[PDB]
Design a protein around this ligand. Sequence first.
Ligand code: CL
Ligand code: CL
Length: 101
Amino acid sequence: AEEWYFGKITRRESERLLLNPENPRGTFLVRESETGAYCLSVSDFDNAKGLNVKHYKIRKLDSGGFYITSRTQFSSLQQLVAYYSKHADGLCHRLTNVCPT
Ligand SMILES: [Cl-]
Ligand SMILES: [Cl-]
């Protein structure tokens, strides 16, 4: 889709948005790599940090495939997002909600 793609937003700006207290665990957004790669930022919770944000680097295979882990690849970012919204499979939490505002 297009709604979860926040483009050129910084890491700190994405964290300010994801730290929203009304955000369910697993709220996310995809952005451009700040450090042509992408990044999946997801909200999470634990007692030590409270609400926090995890950042996953979306890498590209030399053959043309998007991936975060070393056993799963996707033909597009939409397919990657669809996959992780159904299965956590290595991520802190599965994707549950597109980040508001
Ligand atoms: Cl980054
Ligand atoms: Cl990173």
